[PDB]
Design a protein around this ligand. Structure first.
Ligand SMILES: [Cl-]
Ligand SMILES: [Cl-]
Ligand SMILES: [Cl-]
Ligand SMILES: [Cl-]
Lengths: 450, 450
């Protein structure tokens, strides 16, 4: 065996460890600043169109059929504009955009920033400003990875590594700016967006710089109200931690069931239009118009879902209301994401996991009155457990819920629920969702090849 | 290129992503429970020996040269027991042990668990029970990684995946149970301890299982106070975050100077004994007995340093006292670690970084009164910043300080300080220290049998 030359190379490699060149480190600060500025202008444009829509529903308050007509039509034309931009100019800007950057980090999936960037921005502004059940982390990760490719072409950085670092720097900075979550942005690249089956040269120090330069832009220019702001919930005694494994087992079964509902609704809604230009846009105006109609009446069934998360965690919702919200937010998420709308499924998975967790917590409170439980500790453990059972990135989602809810006393319930979600997803035969979107787009790409 | 074939390999690989076998997942629960039970017996044995040491200092409280004698001699005999077990039976159990598990994950540096497990336990009990400036995470990561190899030969699991996962499971469970830090245990494997220059199939889901099983054992059998119990501190305004960049620059310059002092004291303490076991044991009794002497008079200059972190962090130290503590704790950290005692640098780097961060925040208060600062926010940022400059694992040290201080409002101060500590350690020529000890160990056993 020739391990004494593998030892000789390793001593050389250990003494050049963590030696990113200065051009990659400087350009990662240029990428992350531009990502953090583009994500602020995206959030300021989405929140402008939402308050322009809600302002148009308090003006015509004396005519309820006209008030429901405006709620349908303002969100229809906003979604029809967003569907048209994807279908005419950049078809890879439809859906999340995270498998488009994951496919780009392993050298498939070309990064057409001259098309995707003024499509995923303005078309995600119409779908998310129209009140559809879509996250801003869909657009901002693909906008971020395309900005990192946009700053690879202006300054002409040569190198295989510098392509993979800066494309991953902006994708990390786009997730970090969407959630105000810097640790979850870096951990999304190490765990999920990494090429999982080979060694890649992505400098994590450059991914750090772009995340932090993006989070500094969240300070100066973004002025909002700290998206998830649940309080300081109760502690979790360590004899009740088996109840968070039951919750993770429940999540780990629904997770694979939810993924084949995402992939099945993509094939089901594609048979409606047949890939046609105007039938896809007219269907997307009906999906977006319904979610603007379901944002005036029953408003906790549409939107991204961060509103209902503090109304959950042992709040206003009864058990019959929690069942109705969960079923309706499954249908509206499946209609929004599995249709080609620019917008992610990652943040609607946060709201679907919170509702399932607090519905489980309401049962665990009534069943076990000796543990002195509240329903809100299970809504925090469940919040990142649909991200663990469907996207299969538990380390990102446990950290992300820690960034957003700020309850470290519930961290061991969170890791127990996030583990049992991943374990039972593997046991019941589910794949990670972004891998399965990518495995379908690359199989469709090779089926169009003659 | 012929990228038709590598796309088809990617389709097959994404469809069977996250597919750990049942035996590796079940054995990681066996490993993590065993590391969690071995860590609890380690921390209770260190705390029992330290309590019998301070209990002898209340009997002879009237004869002042006598309780200086028995504070020297009780720590000298306990350290001599720790140095004799390493020098006779397991020489790779001296020092931290993180480079020994790092080398083992790259198939150098064999795991002789039949001797390193009784030596690192009872020798680390003698060196930490005597009050040396050493962390217990050194004798818990290596003891954990040996348990993961011990539960590989009893049940006879084969393959490079099972060997590397269970070795990284126990090493992650050893860091998690040493600090009650489950997220920092998982993140230490994905960032520092893994092979850095090749692809390794370490199953990260089984690393979760061992981390969970070790921190669950931290409940049922370990009943002690929190290690660091600093409270809730000031919300750091974003116009003051340039000061945490300067704090990272000071750490990033000192970190390489500290690393040359670690490896430079390893070389000149080795010239005192010359590898002779009797002179090595008598040197470790003088070094370990002095820290028991410094444990009675001026106890802030000795020990693991978790006690002085709440007395720092906007606390009751002066400027001249805090400067005296830093200089005296650098001397005692280098005398304990670089002499080959079982024990780590990781937790005395947390104490050294808190003291340096407190002294920087004390200067920044009197230099910038318009920012309305307190010195404790810079102590939290500084606490993981020597781990960013010396160990060059910023993501683990930022998370580890977040596990044990519970101050998420300083997360953007914590990463700016850790980024500038990693940036200025790279540009001033510093290496990561566990990679520098490993490459010095790998080059040493190469030149004797080449
Ligand atoms: Cl998608
Ligand atoms: Cl998404
Ligand atoms: Cl060492
Ligand atoms: Cl250490």
């Amino acid at each position: 065996q020739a391990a004494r030359l593998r030892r000789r190379q390793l001593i050389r490699q250990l003494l050049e460890r963590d030696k990113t060149p200065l051009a990659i480190l400087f350009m990662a600060a240029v990428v992350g600043t531009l990502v953090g500025l583009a994500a602020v202008a995206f959030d300021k444009g989405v929140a402008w169109l939402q308050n322009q829509r809600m302002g148009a529903l308090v003006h015509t308050a004396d005519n309820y059929p006209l008030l429901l007509t405006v709620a349908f039509l303002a969100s229809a034309v906003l979604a029809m504009f967003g569907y048209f931009l994807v279908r005419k100019y950049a078809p890879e800007a439809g859906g999340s955009g995270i498998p488009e950057i994951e496919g780009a980090l392993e050298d498939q999936r070309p990064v057409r920033w001259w098309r995707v960037l003024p499509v995923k921005f303005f078309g995600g502004l119409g779908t998310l400003g129209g009140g559809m059940v879509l996250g801003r982390e869909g657009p901002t990760v693909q906008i971020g990875g395309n900005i990192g490719r946009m700053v690879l072409d202006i300054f002409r950085l040569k190198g295989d590594e510098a392509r993979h670092t800066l494309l991953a720097t902006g994708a990390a900075a786009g997730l970090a700016a969407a959630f105000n979550a810097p640790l979850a942005g870096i951990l999304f690249i190490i765990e999920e967006m990494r090429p999982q089956f080979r060694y890649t040269l992505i400098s994590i120090k450059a991914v750090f710089i772009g995340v932090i330069m993006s989070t500094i832009m969240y300070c100066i220019f973004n002025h909002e109200v700290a998206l998830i702001d649940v309080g300081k919930l109760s502690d979790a005694p360590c004899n009740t931690l088996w109840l968070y494994l039951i919750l993770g087992i429940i999540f780990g079964i629904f997770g694979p069931i939810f993924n084949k509902w995402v992939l099945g609704m993509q094939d089901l809604l594609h048979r409606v239009h047949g890939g046609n230009i105007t039938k896809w846009v007219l269907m997307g105006g009906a999906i977006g118009g319904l979610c603007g109609l379901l944002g005036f009446v029953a408003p906790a069934t549409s939107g991204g879902g961060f509103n209902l998360i503090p109304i959950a965690t042992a709040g206003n919702f009864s058990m019959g209301m929690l069942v109705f919200i969960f079923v309706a937010r499954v249908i509206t998420t499946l209609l929004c994401f599995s249709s080609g709308a620019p917008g992610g499924i990652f943040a609607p998975m946060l709201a679907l996991g919170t509702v399932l967790g607090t519905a489980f917590g309401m049962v665990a409170v009534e069943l076990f009155p000796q543990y002195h439980l509240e329903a809100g500790t299970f809504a925090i453990a469940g919040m990142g457990a649909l991200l663990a059972a469907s996207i299969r990135a538990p380390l990102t989602g446990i950290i992300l819920v820690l960034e957003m809810t700020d309850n470290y006393q519930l961290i061991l319930p969170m890791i127990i629920t996030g583990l049992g979600a991943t374990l039972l997803a593997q046991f019941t035969g589910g794949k990670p969702l972004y891998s399965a979107i990518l495995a379908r787009t690359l199989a469709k790409q090779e089926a169009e090849q003659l």
